[PDB]
């Protein structure tokens, strides 16, 4: 998750219209990755157990 978010975090900083487009993807994917961390360490262990 850290490397996945690392490939996308710098993308958001870029400005301009292109930066805005990047920011959209960046925010979305980084949030998805963080939640996947939280889900994989909270919900999935309980389900497996």
């Amino acid at each position: 998750a850290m490397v996945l978010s690392a490939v996308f975090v710098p993308m958001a900083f870029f400005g301009g219209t292109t930066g805005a487009i990047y920011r959209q993807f960046s925010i979305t994917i980084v949030a998805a990755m963080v939640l996947s961390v939280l889900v994989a360490m909270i919900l999935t262990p309980a389900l497996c157990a």
Partner: protein, 346 residues
Amino acid sequence: EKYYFTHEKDNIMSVFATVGSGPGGNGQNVARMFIRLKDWSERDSKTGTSFAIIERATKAFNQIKEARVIASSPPAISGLGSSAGFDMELQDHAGAGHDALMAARNQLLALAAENPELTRVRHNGLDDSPQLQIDIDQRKAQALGVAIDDINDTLQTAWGSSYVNDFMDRGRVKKVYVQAAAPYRMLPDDINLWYVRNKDGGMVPFSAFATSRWETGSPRLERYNGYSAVEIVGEAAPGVSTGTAMDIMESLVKQLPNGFGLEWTAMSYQERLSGAQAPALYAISLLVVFLCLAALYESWSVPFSVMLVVPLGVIGALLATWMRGLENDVYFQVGLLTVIGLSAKN
């Protein structure tokens, strides 16, 4: 409309034509037609796509020689521009004049038509037109006792429209206009049909003190920033990048006489601003990934083992993009970053 309802009647849901309104400015000689296609399912998706329809339509319209009819697709972004393709303003910095500006516009259009790298280069405006000039001999006018204000008033009220006041029609206060009847304002000789009143109350014809003379003028004058300019929209040929086409247009405007410069506007302006931040992004992202790997594995060697698989995904993504004939764009870049991330995880 006959063409659209005859040749392609399996893709057109409806057409709506508005005579008098145009993308390059309103006028009696322009018309804008809104064509609405059917759903994507009903269309062929191989020959009924918007692009194929536009291609066939533009061939049939280039066959038309009575007017300049141009079929264009709506812009990629709603706010930026009115149609796809590069957008350029051809200003007149030196203030040479309107005639010099129009001559330079024609010269630039000819130069663009010379280069096959640029397609549909055109002026998004109205060409110069002959316009009548009514010159009144002031001395002869007031020698007959006719006030200049009176002749100006009758001229502007008769030929032009005069909004006197309002009247109420079924609950709404609509305007009241006074103007000459249509048959009496169609020809230059119709000026002589009007009689003004002198001091003594006698009626004098307009032919007594007024003459008419034809002259060239512009029905629409556009000014980009503070300088007179002519907007020159167009399209880029397949293969050559839009930035390269813009540079070609810059070369063309350089070939123009001195005093005329260009300023990209709207989508072209924003495209010129951006597009060079990719390599930086990639480099910074790769450096960040390497540092994160070094932190995770507590080594400066293991990340090199991991970071060598980025090309293994990049080559495949590039091969897939080129094989399908796609283009390196914003979507492609984000894809590349996703591929890099997944290769890193693997």
